Design a protein around this ligand. Structure first.
Ligand SMILES: Cc1cc2c(cc1O)CCN(CC(C)C)[C@@H]2c1ccc(/C=C/C(=O)O)cc1
Ligand SMILES: Cc1cc2c(cc1O)CCN(CC(C)C)[C@@H]2c1ccc(/C=C/C(=O)O)cc1
Lengths: 233, 233
């Protein structure tokens, strides 16, 4: 992983991309929104595990540290994927190609419209920046490696060092993408910062979302350490 | 603000720095922790308002947008200040020079030790990076301008554009600081990214902290829109 070139980092990430899934509802029947969203998210998580194992550097970590990173990052990763898919659909969130919802549809569940609105504003920001696919895959990998790295022994010190080295490679890769597209050195640093600052907002959204999910007080909601460990092991 | 040089941006920020306050308890009497922490934080907020009015670009915004940004960012700003003050005190949090607490002292309040631990790990990270004073003031200004900019009319479009232009100036300023200290171009971009990614974790902490404060269910806890508007107006 640490010997990959920038172009090789980009190809590895593009090749690891998970598929876009569909909502499971009978389209011949009349139009539970949270049920549909939960079932979709549960299926996405399985693909998320397979993706994570393909991000360079990730399978070099201990299984316990892989679980901790996914546990910290899984809702941020679902959210950045949602916002990316929704970028060319102003005013709507493309949960799936058969489940395109507006903010009015969000008002059906108490507390959801506020989350819908933050996600729509994020998609708006990505549109304004003209975010590219190759930049998006870099940012999603940065979420995976960064979100849990501050919340974890000699082995732990070695693991954190490695994670920071991999993050440095992804930064190099972003900058290389921006240099390729012709931006100046000033423009490169400015855009790097613009991109990474949106990650702060994605964290914020994930925390507001997790508050919603925990408030459900339900064993079939939020993947456990043990479920994540079973799927990763 | 947008015509400031990098050196002028740095001096303006260093000159705007608020003072380090002391805890109000009688030091001759025997050793409520949350009472002491709340009273300190309430006094810090008043200085925070005066600081914010001195960050270049901030008073160019509407009063309502100034309130919204402070409302989003005030706990992150208290937290980054705490972690900076604690950097040369391994294992301790320097809430004030007369109130230096360890994680064991945090266990006295339900849910607090988890927050204490995240703040201590952040201070540890800043130590590992050897964060400098001039970098710290840049990052605190970036929190102020970025935390609320995704959650806000023609005026609103003009305000968001301005905020992003000011953020771009602070990015330039960070990079200039790093070039001055002798780092290579690679090292500059890498360190910029390292710094901005810690801001994601600071957001995370602020959200966990706000959950604690809201759970108190108390009108004397968390500054209202109206109190912030009164102090800013
Ligand atoms: C399919 C999908 C659902 C959601 C998001 C992105 C997605 O790609 C982000 C917004 N979020 C809504 C937000 C309020 C969390 C939903 C959602 C809904 C339910 C669950 C539940 C999972 C579980 O119980 O295991 C997770 C995400
Ligand atoms: C003085 C100070 C207190 C705290 C932090 C940083 C500080 O500089 C961050 C950790 N946080 C503790 C965290 C659990 C919020 C405390 C704290 C405690 C109480 C309040 C209450 C304010 C109010 O009621 O208006 C705010 C911050």
């Amino acid at each position: 992983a640490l010997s990959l070139t920038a172009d090789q980092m980009v190809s590895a990430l593009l090749d690891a991309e998970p598929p876009i899934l569909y909502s499971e509802y009978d389209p011949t029947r009349p139009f539970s929104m949270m049920g549909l969203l939960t079932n979709l998210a549960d299926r996405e998580l399985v693909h998320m595990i397979n993706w994570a194992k393909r991000v360079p550097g990730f399978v070099d970590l201990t299984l316990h540290d892989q679980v901790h990173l996914l546990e910290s990052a899984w809702l941020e990763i679902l959210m950045i994927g949602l916002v990316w898919r929704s970028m060319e659909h102003p005013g709507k969130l493309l949960f799936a190609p058969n489940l395109l919802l507006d903010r009015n549809q969000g008002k059906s569940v108490e507390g959801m419209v506020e989350i819908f609105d933050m996600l729509l504003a994020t998609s708006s920001r990505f549109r304004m920046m003209n975010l590219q696919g190759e930049e998006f895959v870099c940012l999603k990998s940065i979420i995976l490696l960064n979100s849990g790295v501050y919340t974890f022994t000699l082995k732990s010190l070695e693991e954190k060092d490695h994670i920071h080295r991999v993050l440095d490679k992804i930064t190099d890769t972003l900058i290389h993408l921006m240099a390729k597209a012709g931006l100046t050195l000033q423009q490169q640093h400015q855009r790097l910062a613009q991109l990474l600052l949106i990650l702060s907002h994605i964290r914020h959204m994930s925390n507001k979302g997790m508050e919603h999910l925990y408030s459900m007080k339900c064993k079939n909601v939020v993947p456990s350490y043990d479920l994540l460990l079973e799927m990763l092991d």
